[model samples]
Structures are given as structure tokens and as C-alpha cells.
Target: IGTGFPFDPHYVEVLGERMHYVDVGPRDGTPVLFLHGNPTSSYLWRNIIPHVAPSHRCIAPDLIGMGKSDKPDLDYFFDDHVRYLDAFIEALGLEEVVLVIHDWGSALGFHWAKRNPERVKGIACMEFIRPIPTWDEWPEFARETFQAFRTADVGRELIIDQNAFIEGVLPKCVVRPLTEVEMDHYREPFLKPVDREPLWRFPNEIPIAGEPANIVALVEAYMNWLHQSPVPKLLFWGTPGVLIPPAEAARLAESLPNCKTVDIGPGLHYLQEDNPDLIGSEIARWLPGLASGLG
Candidate 1:
């Protein structure tokens, strides 16, 4: 965006790749991890982090090859992300932190929480890889597009050749019209086709129709833990959402233990864009009562 990110860019050596992040707030305050998903970066949370950082150590990382991070040569697969993220956490020596997750970040964030329940204090999540959809269950809008995205030759053409996810999809995902400047910020990182390899991988990992048994099973594994995890869950959702629909949000509110779902008004893929102020205020209010009991 024209305003660009205000926070100082902080980088740490995570494995061989240098990870770019924004770390702010009191050093003694509990750390709040903000993870952005595909084709987006820590910049996605720029408007949202200020409202929550007064009393919490807010950290938002640009997942490898996205945002300002180093783009090393790698497959950029799901596990590739998992390794970088896990290393990022260890690199910072973060333990017993709260999670604020969105987009594909839901998978990386949730997987970490599921595996190291003892280290996670609470989870605040929405609009990402929650309850991975089968082709039958996915919305009519995404089914066809994702199906094509999952295909071999066709997906490359749409993503790499056309730059569809950046040029077309991201703008549509935001409810309010993105300024030409705002749109350009997201596009700046992946202007080249090669940089878009990570973007192409995200849609393919959706596990639609359960065709990719490994990812389906991977998502399923954590989903079961989500239903049962006793950690406090703050679920902010919106109407007609792409991944987490309104009705489905209600279902989660009712079924998931220790869960509270707040309506963030209208949104599709990126709820934070539509409701960052509300999201931040609510989270700031909710953090004090976290199970970790930080104020």
C-alpha cells in the first residue's frame, strides 16, 4: 500500500533463510504470533496489530518466499513452510504464546498448537484452512476454480502465466475496494512468475475432494484435535466466507469447546481486511482473559 508498513522490519536467521518479521510491544508481555497465508505477508496484519500490541508482544512473520523474506530455491510445499515456521519459533525461543492466525496460516498455526499444546496459551483464528473442504462440500464459486488449480498444466497457466491469484483473486477476496496503491503492495513481492510458485502451491494444498490423501489426512489430524483441544479459542467470522462460512461458523461455535465466535460483519477470504478494527479491539479485550491469564 502507499502508506506501506510502519513497523521496523526485523529479521532473524532461521535455518539458511533469513525470515522477516515485525516484533513490537513490551518485552515482558506475552507474545502474540500473527501468521499470514499465501500470496500475502506480515503486511496483511499492518492495520490490525496496533490495537493489540499495547499489552502483548506482537510478532508477524513473512512466511518464506513471501513478503520481504528471502526467496530461497525450494518446493514451497506445506511441510516446507512447517519447517521454516517451526524453526522461526525456536529461533525466537517463543514458548507459551497466543496465536492470531489467518489464511493458510491456520494450518501452520494450528499444527504447531496441536503438536505442542503445552507451549500454546490460546488460539484466535479465522478464514483459513479450517475443516478442509471436500469437492462436494466446497462452495460452488471455489470448486471449479480450485479444481482447475489442482490440475497440472492448467494451474501453472492460471497462476504463473497469468498471475491470476495476485492480479485477480486477492482483490476479489477483500470486501472493500482495494486502492490501486493497496493492490500494488501485495503485487510488489511477486511481480515475477518464478516468485509465484508459492502462490500456486497454496490452492493445490486445499485437499478438495480429498484427492490429496496426505494433506487431507494432515488437515484431518489437527481438525480432530481442534474439536477436542481445551485451549481457549477466539473465533472471529463473517458472512458468506469462502473457507469458514456463516453457518459453519455457527456450527463451530456450538461444537468446539472453549470457543467464542464473534461476527466481524461482511467478508469472504480475508476477514481482517473487512474488519481489522473490530478484530483488533475484540482481541485486545479478549487477551486479558486468556487461559494463560496475561493482561
Candidate 2:
């Protein structure tokens, strides 16, 4: 029983994997799905869900192996992640959804929306997407950081077994301190070596712009389609930078039509952890109109 969040954990079987998720709010309330990125789980939205669940149904599923969700031996590819999400949605029979995405969630959630455009009502996004900023756009520090993770075996260990990745990066990524307990929650899923494989693989898997690295081609194609699609988009700009920086949000606002951008003050990649009340209130204020009256 996770005590930090209000919702109870529920399991759904997808592709033979027993997947876990947190479901909050009334069954009849509007559905809002929150997707998290690497290293974090549905715990990312622990605070945000309580606020919105009161008015709208909130669904935050731990991506196959990331959160309280089941971690089984699998490839953990982007397509497979998307496929699991599709099956999850079909299993739950969700409709008229407003998607809230962050970090890797942007890629996974957006891909789902692209596959089922009619089901999307609006999108509230933060810090991540499928598009790579230009090749020249890569900051020296960011490039170095990514390259280290890409090439170094030591970096792999730091990213998984040790708290170095989160400690070194998370403090700078957000505007506040993440308490020890919260940090542990983020670290809980990878307590064992087997649980750390996906963490090790994720950095190496990132596709630089137009480099055709790993899943880049597939993610790029999905993003191209999303840019052309008619979905409403909103950006929650976390201050400083996170896995997806403020620059990416600005670029996305310019590229996507019918998109709005909001500034999140003193925030981090895990903005909900930094200031759950603000993030939750923002969603509560913005989500009602987007909630679906239909099944």
C-alpha cells in the first residue's frame, strides 16, 4: 500500500504482463491520463491526482517496469510501450481523454493519441517529446552528459544502481529539494539489478535528431504526425531545465497549432514533486472543459 498517494493500485493484464496503475476519482467523472517518464512512476502524480480526481477521473499507469507496475524480462522498446498502452486503454474502455505527459510520457502518450486521434480531447504537456532539438541545438553540457551515458559503463551503473544520476541531475533539474522519502520512491522500482536493465538501456536508446539512433526513426515519424494533427496542446514550462528543458517547450509551442504555454515557477523535471498543489490546481482549473461527457 503506497501511502504518499490517495489512489489505490490496480492491476490490468496486457500482452500477458500484469500491469499496475493508479485510478482515482469517480468512475463517471471525466478521464485525464497522466504519463510519466524514466526513473519515476505514478508517484510522480501522487499529489496532482487527488486534486483533479475530485472533479475528474485521473489515470496514471506505471509504464511496464518503471513504477509499482510489473517489471518483467522484455525488450522495453518504444513500440512495445505504445502497444501496451493501447491495450490498456482498450481494456479500460477510456474515452474523450485529456492527456498530461512529461519526459518520456510525451513520446508514449502522444504516439497513442496519434493512433487514436478521435479519442483525444486536449493535451497538457511538460518537458518531453519525440522531436530532437536541432543537432546544433544540443548544449555542450547536455551533449557531454548524454554522450557519457551513451558510452561509459560507469555512467550505466550511476544511472541505475547509484543515486548519482538523480542526485546529480535532479537537484539542478528542479527548483526545489526532493526529500529523502520522495527520492526513495523514485528509486524503489530499481532496487534489484534485474530491475535496472531498462534504466541502463534508456539512455543508450535516445535518438539524436536525424541520427537514426535506435528508435529515433519511429519516434520521429510519430512526432511528425502529431505536429500535423489537430489536437489542442498546452505546455507546462518547468523552470531551469529537466530531462526536457524549457527550450523544448518553447519550440513545441511554436510548432504545434492551437497550443498554449504556461510557466511553472521554481520547478523541476518532477514538477509535481516540487509543487504538487500548483500543478494540481493548474490541471483542475484547466481540465473540466476538456473532460468527456460521453463514454
Candidate 3:
């Protein structure tokens, strides 16, 4: 419903499922893949895409059941998402990709990159996903969020499916306020029941302290590989946030020897929405140099 950038949306056969994605900017330009989290669609990058697409080919895909992609009523697991992404990368013949991932996207993308580190040139993130390395100081609030999603069906139904958390609760969790239109963008995807799957799946899928499910195993492997690998990494942490606290960013930087962290002030968990210009510019500036291996 906005003046969108020029691009093509293509369907790829990913793990016995058809997935949709957007391909923008020059066809032969260096590829920068953007992956969103939770209830947000590729629309999460709508504002940032036009700015970066000019110099680098920017591609954003709707994760399985999230966005305009296929939402079949099947058992969607984290590894399943990884498999789908692998198929997509192969199907599109993408190489030396500059990976930009956020939230659950970090977990999914990291796992794929960990497996094929050669194809990945650099990685950038916002509110990234990595397992609690040793769970000693794991917050009770995080545990509470995980348990609520695991045990309480009502919490899942209301907080996630209804977009109540993003619209109603996220602002309260943040130390700053979101603009009216920005709030609308975050709430746009969950306008219906079916569109809420990813939202519920995200919180419900947290693998804190290796509790609740197998997600911890997936995250652990990804984090371990990220720590060991030499892939250049950058982290943008939103201060006064909802999820992925400042300490977690610090931990990630400490673990990934080639990584650095940036505190995007006056940002919420959805930092792109809260400060698109500042955050987007930072990404555009840093990504090109990293892509060229000069960083």
C-alpha cells in the first residue's frame, strides 16, 4: 500500500514447499540478503531497501508462514526454516552473500552460514539470537516469556496472534516511544489469525537454558560455529529494549572475535522501525566495506 521499490518477487522450491522473496537493485550487484523475525514480513526492510538497493542488490524474503509467503498448516520447526533457506540460496544461485539477519532470522541464517561459511562474506544483525552460553545469569523475565509461550495457550493466542504484544506490550517494554506509523507497520502483518503463526512461534520457540524444546540445540550449534568461524560480524543493539539485552550483545562480541557492537540509541527491539535513517545508514556504510573484505 506504499510506493514500493522496483523489484521482482520470485517463488523458489524450498524443502518441498514454495517460498516467496523479493529481489531488488542491480541483478549482478553484490547480494545482501535481509531476513526478518517473528510477525514482521520482508516489509520490515521496505524503508531500508530503497536506500541500499542502489549500490548493492538487496533481497528480502518472507519467512515460510510469515509475510506473503506460503503458510501451509504443517509442523514448522527451526531446522525446517534453515533447510528452506539453504534451498533458496541454491535455487537463486547466490554466492558470497552479505547476510543481514534480525531476531529469529539470526538463528536461521547463522545456522545456514555456519554450514556453508565459504558462501558467506560478512554478517550483520539487530537483536540477534544466540543461546545462553552457560545460563548462570539467565533472567527470570526471559524464562517467564519462554514459559508463558510454552505452557499458556491463552498467552500465545492473545500476545502473539493478536499482535497485542507488538502493539500493546512492546512499547511498554521499551524505554522510548514509537511513532504512530511505525507502530502501525509492526502491527500490520498480524491483521488476521493465519498471519500470526510466526509471532507465536518465535517466543514459543526460545530455547533458554535448554528448556522446553530442541531449539536450544539448534541455537547452540549456530552460536558455537559463529564463535569459531572468522566471518566478519557486526551487532546493533537497541538500548532499553524488549528482547536481546545489551549484555547479550556484549556476550556476542566477546565470543565472536571478529565482531563489533553498536548501540543504536533511542531504539526499540524493532530498531529498524524506531530509527530507520540512522540505523539504515550505519548498515549501508558498514556493509559495503565488509563486503569488499576491507573491514
Which is the leading candidate under TM-score? Answer: 1
lDDT per residue (tens digit) for residues 78-133 in model 2: 66677788888888889778899987788888778877788888888877756455
Q: Report how far off residue 277 is in candidate 3 (Å).
A: 1.8
- Give all candidates' CA lDDT scores: 0.86, 0.73, 0.72
Tens digits of per-residue lDDT, candidate 3, 1-295, equal 2324345677787777778888878888669999987656687777778777778888898888766677777556675677677778888898779888988888888878878889888888887776654445445544455456666677666665656557655565445465667566566556776656666666767776666448887777877888888888878887655456776777777878688687877665677766666656777788766645533
- Which residue ranges in model 1 land beyond 4 Å of their true spot? 1-3, 291-295
Per-candidate TM-scores read 0.96, 0.88, 0.84
Better of 2 and 3 by TM-score: 2
- Output the worst ten-in-a-row residue range by lDDT, candidate 3: 134-143
- Per lDDT, the best of the predicted structures is 1
1-295: candidate 1 lDDT, tens digit per residue: 2236789989999989999999998886579999999778998898889998887899999999999998988878899999999999999998789999987898999899889999888899988685455566777776777778888899989998999888878888878888877778888888878989999988888766674678788888888898999898999888788888898898999888999889999988888778888889988999888743434
